[PDB]
Amino acid sequence: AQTVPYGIPLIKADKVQAQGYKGANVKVGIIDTGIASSHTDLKVVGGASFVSGESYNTDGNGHGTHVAGTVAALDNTTGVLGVAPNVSLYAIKVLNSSGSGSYSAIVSGIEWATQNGLDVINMSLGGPSGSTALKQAVDKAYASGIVVVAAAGNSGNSGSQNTIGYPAKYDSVIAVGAVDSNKNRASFSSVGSELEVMAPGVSVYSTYPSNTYTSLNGTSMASPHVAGAAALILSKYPTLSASQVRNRLSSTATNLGDSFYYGKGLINVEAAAQ
Ligand SMILES: *C[C@@](*)(O)[C@H](Cc1ccccc1)NC(=O)[C@@H]1CCCN1C(=O)[C@H](C)NC(=O)OCc1ccccc1
Ligand SMILES: [Ca+2]
Numbered sequence: 001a002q003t004v005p006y007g008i009p010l011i012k013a014d015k016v017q018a019q020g021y022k023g024a025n026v027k028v029g030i031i032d033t034g035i036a037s038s039h040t041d042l043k044v045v046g047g048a049s050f051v052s053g054e055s056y057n058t059d060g061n062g063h064g065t066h067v068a069g070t071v072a073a074l075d076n077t078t079g080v081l082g083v084a085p086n087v088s089l090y091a092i093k094v095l096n097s098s099g100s101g102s103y104s105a106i107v108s109g110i111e112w113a114t115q116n117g118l119d120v121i122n123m124s125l126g127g128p129s130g131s132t133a134l135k136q137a138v139d140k141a142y143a144s145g146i147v148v149v150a151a152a153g154n155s156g157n158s159g160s161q162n163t164i165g166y167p168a169k170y171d172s173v174i175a176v177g178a179v180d181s182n183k184n185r186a187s188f189s190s191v192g193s194e195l196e197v198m199a200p201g202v203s204v205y206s207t208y209p210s211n212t213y214t215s216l217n218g219t220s221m222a223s224p225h226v227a228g229a230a231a232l233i234l235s236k237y238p239t240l241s242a243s244q245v246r247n248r249l250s251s252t253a254t255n256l257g258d259s260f261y262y263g264k265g266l267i268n269v270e271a272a273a274q
């Protein structure tokens with residue numbers, strides 16, 4: 001039987017799916033450690049690998065497969081349910097199975113999504129420093145009309161210090177922080193003025209290689225709820241621009257507190273999709 005992880009109802013994605021909008025026709029690229037296509041609850045339609053020796057439809061780390069199941073685990077009678085179960089899912093492998101990737105892999109993975117006309121890209125990954133080439137790649141994806149979403153970082157706060165990673169810190173990228181099921185900001189969620197919205201990131205149950213399920217914590221788990229919310233919005237209003245989708249999610253978020261800590265708050269896809 002299918003389990004619905006708490007994040008789905010928490011962001012009101014169930015209400016939008018009940019209206020019949022489930023992300024069909026929206027191409028979502030998961031830029032991560034790959035996706036285990038072998039998983040019975042996921043359907044990967046394409047992708048690219050920028051990690052030598054590894055193809056994109058395998059995942060020996062598990063992070064990309066977990067992130068993929070939060071956006072798009074199929075709605076059937078098994079496993080879990082994604083935020084946008086009918087999206088066309090692309091595996092863009094830029095990190096190897098030990099979780100290490102180069103700036104150049106990451107830039108090529110973003111450029112690949114831009115050249116291939118994807119609608120939304122999720123980057124549950126980041127580093128303490130960015131690069132010109134990384135900045136030019138995200139700005140070109142957003143300017144081309146792609147909704148670019150990234151995990152803010154799992155560095156917590158350190159006084160006044162902004163701990164948002166790159167690429168989340170770039171203005172063309174939505175930086176997503178993590179809350180638990182009670183709407184508390186997770187202790188590990190990164191903070192800073194670029195923090196834009198919050199989503200479930202604590203004990204998020206989703207798909208895991210090769211064909212299992214597991215609970216993980218991270219802003220990596222939050223980010224996919226926001227990329228899936230963007231796909232639900234585009235399945236309902238297909239011709240909206242990236243900045244219209246982005247403003248609907250932050251403008252309708254439920255305010256949770258100080259924006260250095262919660263950005264505009266917890267996304268509410270029912271309100272955002274009105
Ligand atoms: C699992 C998840 O919660 C985190 C999200 C995150 C972590 C750090 C900073 C921002 C966001 N994602 C990861 O831990 C992923 C999955 C395995 C390894 N990984 C990374 O993000 C690694 C730590 N980073 C990566 O190699 O970044 C390389 C990079 C170079 C240049 C610019 C950006 C990133
Ligand atoms: Ca399922």
Ligand code: NA
Nearest residue numbers: 168169170173
């Ligand atoms: Na940003």
